[PDB]
RNA sequence: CGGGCGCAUUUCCAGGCGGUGCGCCGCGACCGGCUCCGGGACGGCUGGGAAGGCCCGGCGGGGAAGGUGGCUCGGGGCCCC
């Protein structure tokens, strides 16, 4: 992203800048399981009665 | 140090993305283990054994026996059924 400026030409703007604070000893990532759906994507069952 | 404000940084307000949640609960679909129930089709036997369903022509002997035949009881009009 490059936008115009007032003086000194135009300067490039970097979107999604680097974070400013890092929490120590962050939690690692999961093992990427499968077959797990959210509640909105579950199949709905009904009894014949 | 200096040249410089759509740019970058400091605070508050209101929303979304991935990691975390006072107490008491509930729900959903997948995964593993386990018990139980229902339904439907397949192979073998002596290519299962025995009954069923119509009868034609016909053989055998026999008993846990239709009539015949002393006797017993009862019903209806000595006798009769």
UniProtKB/Swiss-Prot annotation:
Modified residues (Phosphoserine): 33
Signal sequence extent: none
Localization: Cytoplasm, Cytosol; Cytoplasm; Rough endoplasmic reticulum
Subunit structure, as described in the record: Component of the large ribosomal subunit. May bind IPO9 with low affinity.
Function: Component of the large ribosomal subunit. The ribosome is a large ribonucleoprotein complex responsible for the synthesis of proteins in the cell.
Highest taxon listed in the record's lineage: Eukaryota
Protein name stated in the entry: Large ribosomal subunit protein eL6
Family as reported in the entry's similarity comment: Belongs to the eukaryotic ribosomal protein eL6 family.
